[PDB]
Amino acid sequence: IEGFGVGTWDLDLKTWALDWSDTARTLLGIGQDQPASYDLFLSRLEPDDRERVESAIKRVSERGGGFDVSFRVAGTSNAGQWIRARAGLIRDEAGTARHLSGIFLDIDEEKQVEGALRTRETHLRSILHTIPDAMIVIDGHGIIQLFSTAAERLFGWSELEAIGQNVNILMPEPDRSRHDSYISRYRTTSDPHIIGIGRIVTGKRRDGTTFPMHLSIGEMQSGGEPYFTGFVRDLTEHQQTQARLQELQSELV
Amino acid sequence: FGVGTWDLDLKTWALDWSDTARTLLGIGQDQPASYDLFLSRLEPDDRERVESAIKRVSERGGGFDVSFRVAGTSNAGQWIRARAGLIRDEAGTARHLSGIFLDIDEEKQVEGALRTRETHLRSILHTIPDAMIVIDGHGIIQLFSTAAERLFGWSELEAIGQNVNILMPEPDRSRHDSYISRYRTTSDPHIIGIGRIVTGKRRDGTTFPMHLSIGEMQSGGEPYFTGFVRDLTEHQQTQARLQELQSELV
Ligand code: HEM
Ligand code: HEM
């Protein structure tokens, strides 16, 4: 109760009387000496979560319940206090549903973690759509997990077509049949042949046509499994320009 | 229902918890509420760190939260955040300790997902062949790839926080902040979508032909742009060789 760090509160469906903790007063940004009031509790809230609050108290009134709703208050000028109000029902007897008691939780840090994840996901999508090189992400066994827009244009598969399939569908033989062992050999020996180095190889479209590409791989670890992020650059025009360079310099020579 | 409730009074060392509280702990529902039973659900290294925490809160004053996982239900553990405070019987005697049990399995999944995305962001930043740069709505560098460091000669910690205009010659340098500013109001892109060959400037002072590709995104009321920069210094080496060789024919 002293230094608890969590607010507590009470509200009765009949007589609408409310008593919150002193730790709860600070969370609402008001109440230095003034008394607890449910109308005052409304005043601190912004007028969207308001209607969701009485919708919640009407929902928990009906037969049963469970009460948890989240909101932000205007405590400070350029910041908001995010609070998750959680509560449970206690009936007097078999007769009616009397006062509902609960807690106020400070969920500033949880919402901060939320937004950070949301930003990272949004940004990952932008990287996938914008990157000029074809970006492919596989798991420890070569199973495509992400497939960039450039990769779609280059290999002729869509993201939904490619994600879940083995990365060896992108390459001709013998590399297609050997690519699983390439990954397994790397994982046991830790001796890289393309990671950090880079290699020009031949990639294969869904058409069946083949094209010269530069491959670059980087590794990561998540939940006990590695993931490999590949970057593919189409060298079909680069060696086409080299084919121009060598044959045009022949008629000079 | 709601979250679980419990109290462990320091006087008489008893402990009682609510009906939703015991389901969170994985209580067999025959067992009664005892403090030695609570410590039997926790895993060994968690156990001692919990018991380290109560010893640090044995000092009269304050509050107590710990997070842990019990694992006997689904092969993936149940995460609980146990938060508690003190009440005092008299002026100098602390008697009861009352608090709550919070299911936080969702809170730990978002943590892990964020961790994975952050790890993958670092992997891309190290590995992408083109220079990747990320700016906010005002042109301040927020992320700076390894390839960008090698191309522009600034370090990540040097570049981040600085305006992106330090990467380009004049007059683009002085005009770049207007370019972003006009784009934000008008929404008419000139490089977003299209892809422009421009000239960039290293910290050296030297310049080079680069290709710029920009992608937009929105987060927290501010746009962010991700620039992909490719050096064309060897591409135009071959283009100059092609131009000289086919001009020597005519
Ligand atoms: C699409 C055409 C591709 C071809 C032809 C190809 C070919 C190869 C070859 C030949 C090796 C082994 C080199 C050696 O042992 O001498 C290799 C290794 C490997 N590749 Fe692929 N690859 C392709 C795409 C990818 C992509 C897109 C990824 C990841 C997203 C990837 C992941 C790996 C990994 C993890 C290894 C083992 C690590 C290493 O040897 O450094 N490959 N690849
Ligand atoms: C380093 C050398 C760079 C140069 C020389 C350069 C040049 C330019 C120019 C000339 C424009 C205006 C186009 C016009 O009005 O016709 C522009 C716009 C823009 N640039 Fe830069 N840029 C550079 C780097 C970057 C990077 C790395 C990013 C992103 C991280 C970026 C973000 C933007 C944005 C958001 C716009 C406005 C939207 C648009 O017009 O597409 N710039 N840039």
Curated annotation (Swiss-Prot), chain A:
Q: Which GO terms describe its cellular component?
A: plasma membrane
Question: GO annotations under biological process?
Answer: nitrogen fixation; phosphorelay signal transduction system; regulation of DNA-templated transcription
Listed binding positions for heme are 179
Q: Where is the PAC domain?
A: 67-119, 188-247
Q: How is its activity regulated?
A: The heme moiety regulates the kinase activity.
- EC number in record: 2.7.13.3
Cofactor mode of binding and number, as noted = Binds 1 heme group per subunit.
Q: Which domain of life is it from?
A: Bacteria
Catalytic activity of the protein:
ATP + protein L-histidine = ADP + protein N-phospho-L-histidine
Q: Which GO terms describe its molecular function?
A: ATP binding; histidine phosphotransfer kinase activity; metal ion binding; phosphorelay sensor kinase activity
Keywords of this entry: ATP-binding, Heme, Iron, Kinase, Metal-binding, Nitrogen fixation, Nucleotide-binding, Phosphoprotein, Repeat, Transferase, Two-component regulatory system
Essential cofactor(s):
heme
Identify the residues that the record assigns to the PAS domain, covering every copy. Answer: 1-64, 120-187
Function text = Putative oxygen sensor; modulates the activity of FixJ, a transcriptional activator of nitrogen fixation fixK gene. FixL probably acts as a kinase that phosphorylates FixJ.
Q: What is this protein called?
A: Sensor protein FixL
Write the gene name. Answer: fixL
